[PDB]
Paper text:
TRIM7 was also previously identified in a genome-wide overexpression screen as an inhibitor of the picorna-like virus calicivirus murine norovirus (MNV), an activity similarly found to be PRYSPRY-dependent. Remarkably, in ITC experiments with TRIM7 PRYSPRY, all peptides bound with comparable affinity. Solving the co-crystal structures of each complex revealed that the different peptides are bound in the same PRYSPRY pocket, with the penultimate two residues responsible for most of the binding interaction. In each case, there is the potential for hydrogen bonds between the terminal glutamine residue and TRIM7 residues N383, R385, G408, Q436 and S499. An additional hydrogen bond is also formed between the peptidyl oxygen of the penultimate peptide residue (L or F) and the peptidyl nitrogen of TRIM7 residue T384. In the context of TRIM7 as a restriction factor, this means that CVB3 proteins VP3, 3A and 2C and MNV proteins NS3 and NS6 are possible TRIM7 ligands. For example, human norovirus proteins do not have identical C-termini as MNV1 proteins (e.g., in Norwalk virus, NS6 ends in EGETALE rather than LEALEFQ, but NS3 maintains a terminal LQ).
TRIM7 catalyzes the ubiquitination of multiple substrates with unrelated biological functions. Here we show that TRIM7′s extreme substrate promiscuity is due to a highly unusual binding mechanism, in which the PRYSPRY domain captures any ligand with a C-terminal helix that terminates in a hydrophobic residue followed by a glutamine. This viral processing strategy generates novel substrates for TRIM7 and explains its ability to inhibit Coxsackie virus and norovirus replication.
Author numbering: -2 to 170
Write the structure that this text describes.
């Protein structure tokens, strides 16, 4: 199965995020690193993109996910805002799933959409820029979790947020 190789982009990472050395894994730390601000860095929201943005075609990858609340992952338009507190919503260029209050959500606005999917360990993301879709599948039985149909009009970047200690996101492969 032909999947893209993604690495987290340290220039984008919120200063409190802890990236692994292989740039696959993301946790939230207790203290903000002293990092030089970069126009790309999320200075307030607890997010980080892969260094790869997408302009065209179909691309797959997988995300392993902690069992404790705190994570959200998906894709974001390149213009997603980095500076100050920003809403986490499709309006703002953010199409994600989320584990929060013991519940899986698709992050619709103005209300999140509860998913009835059972426990997740690993999710396949399929980004289709030709049709304009991003779908999520539980790898155990490739069960369908959610699709956002979107007419993407700029580059689309894999997105990760961890806003609690005690949980993680890991990119595969």
């Amino acid at each position: 199965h032909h999947m893209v190789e993604l690495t987290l982009d340290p220039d984008t990472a919120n200063p409190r995020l802890i990236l692994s050395l292989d740039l696959k894994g993301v946790r939230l730390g207790e203290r903000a690193q002293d990092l030089p601000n970069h126009p790309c860095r999320f200075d307030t929201n607890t997010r980080v993109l892969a260094s790869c943005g997408f302009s065209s075609g179909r691309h797959h990858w997988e995300v392993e996910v902690g069992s404790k609340d705190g994570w959200a992952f998906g894709v974001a338009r390149e213009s997603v805002r980095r500076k100050g507190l920003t809403p986490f919503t499709p309006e703002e260029g953010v199409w994600a799933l989320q584990l929060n209050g013991g519940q899986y959500w698709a992050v619709t606005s103005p209300e999140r959409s509860p998913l009835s999917c059972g426990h997740l360990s690993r999710v396949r993301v399929a980004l289709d820029l030709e049709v304009g879709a991003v779908s999520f599948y539980a790898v155990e039985d490739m069960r369908h979790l959610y699709t956002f149909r979107v007419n993407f009009q700029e580059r689309v970047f894999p997105l990760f947020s961890v806003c609690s200690t005690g949980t993680y996101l890991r990119i595969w492969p």
